[PDB]
Structures are given as C-alpha cells and as structure tokens.
C-alpha cells in the first residue's frame, strides 16, 4: 500500500473533538509517544488493552484530527498532525504534553 | 460545597475529557471570562438531566466547584488547582475556544 487512512481536513477539526481525543490515559499516552518518538507502528503501543479498545482509540485519534495514519504494506503507521494542531490551536499540544505523566 | 475531588485525584485525562465536549467547554469558557456564575446562564438545547450530568462531569473531573446559595447553584472554575497541576493548560484551551 501507499496511502493515508481517512483523516479530516484542517477545516473540520474542532477544539472539543481534539480534547475528547486526548481525554483518555491511553490516547494521551499515544499522543505523548508520537510527539516524542515520531512515527510509530500501531503495534508499538502495548498497554494491556483489549485490541478492540486500542482500535477505537486510534480511530478516535484519527477522526478527531490528532493522528495521521498511513498504511504501507501490511502495517499501519501513526503520525501526530503537529502542524495542523499548531495552526488551529496554538500552544495546546505543548500545554497538554508538558502536563502529561509518562504512562 | 457540592461534591468535588481533592487536588490529588484530579488527572489530566479527566480534565481533558471534561473539556472535550462543546457544552462543557462552553460552560468553562463562560466561567473563565464572566467569573462565578450561578443560575441558567447555560441555556442550551439540552435535556435537563444531561446538562446536570455535564456539571457532574465538570465537578468530578476537578474543573468546576459548585456551591449552593439558596435555590441557586453557584459555579466557579477551579483555576487555582488547574494552574497548580497543569500550568498554561486553561489558557491554551480558552485561547482557541469559540462560542458555541
């Protein structure tokens, strides 16, 4: 494969949607890891979580506008939409990441 | 005061979850500018029990402190606690918050 999974346009990202997507210890930790380690394979996050719940987590991160997910080959690789979030919500990301605790 | 957690039990995912809703975010946005607000300043097209759950979520997550004065419920942003635990978060959020 060589394509990006569905992601909203900058136009359709809302502040409540982003906060909801960050509003979970697992998702917050995903974003924390994506912010510090760059792109990560979907399997990179082993949290002792039901795979259905982890799948829902990434889907929320994608649909909310936080995460850009790419499918290359068999696996899905995840990336923080840093420019989109900074342009829409200056200071939000750094404010959230400065306050997060390493899960 | 109504139910409210101790500062030790306020977490960031819980605060962000409480803010991650347009009605709840609107409540916080009003309380930040116009200060301690009683009463039905939060008149949205929402079920009464659902607006009540919104306030319960805001209280349980450590965002809002509510006290009863007469028949009225005076709500107050826990700015001190939130700034103490999560400096800059509230401003980062309010800077981009738009009226609903």
Author numbering:
A (entry chain A): 0 to 102
B (entry chain B): 3 to 102
Task: Give the original sentences from the paper that presented this experimental model.
In the heterocystous cyanobacterium Nostoc sp. PCC 7120, one such strategy is the use of an ArsR-SmtB transcriptional regulator RexT that senses H2O2 and upregulates expression of thioredoxin to maintain cellular redox homeostasis. Different from many other members of the ArsR-SmtB family which bind metal ions, RexT has been proposed to use disulfide bond formation as a trigger to bind and release DNA. Here, we present high-resolution crystal structures of RexT in the reduced and H2O2-treated states. These structures reveal that RexT showcases the ArsR-SmtB winged-helix-turn-helix fold and forms a vicinal disulfide bond to orchestrate a response to H2O2. Each protomer of RexT has an α1-α2-α3-α4-β1-β2-α5a/b architecture.
To visualize the structural consequence of Cys residue oxidation, a 2.16-Å resolution structure of H2O2-treated RexT was solved (RexT_Ox). These crystals were prepared by removing crystals of reduced RexT from the anaerobic chamber and immersing them in a solution of cryoprotectant that contained H2O2. The oxidized structure shares a similar overall architecture with that of reduced RexT (rmsd of 0.380 Å for 1258 atoms). In chain A of the RexT dimer, a slight orientation difference is observed for both the Cys40 and Cys41 sidechains relative to the reduced structure. In contrast, in the α3 helix region of chain B, in agreement with the above-described biochemical results, the electron density is consistent with the presence of a disulfide bond between Cys40 and Cys41. To form this disulfide bond, Cys41 undergoes a large conformational change: the sidechain flips −167.8° and moves 8.8-Å away from its position in the reduced structure. Formation of this vicinal disulfide bond results in the creation of an eight-membered ring with the peptide backbone and distortion of the peptide bond geometry. In addition to this observed peptide bond distortion, the movement of Cys41 disrupts the interactions seen in the reduced structure between the backbone and sidechain of Cys41 and residues His75 and Asn77 from the wing of the wHTH motif. The lack of a disulfide bond in chain A is proposed to be due to crystal packing, which would prohibit a comparable movement of these residues. Through this analysis, it was found that a cavity leads from the surface of the protein to a cluster of amino acids that includes Cys41. This cavity contains one molecule of H2O2 in chain A of the H2O2-treated structure and one molecule of glycerol in chain B of the reduced structure, suggesting the possibility that H2O2 gains access to Cys41 using this route. In the oxidized structure, the newly formed disulfide bond is oriented towards the protein surface and perhaps coupled with the architectural changes in RexT, more favorably interacts with reduced TrxA2 and permits subsequent resolving of the disulfide linkage.
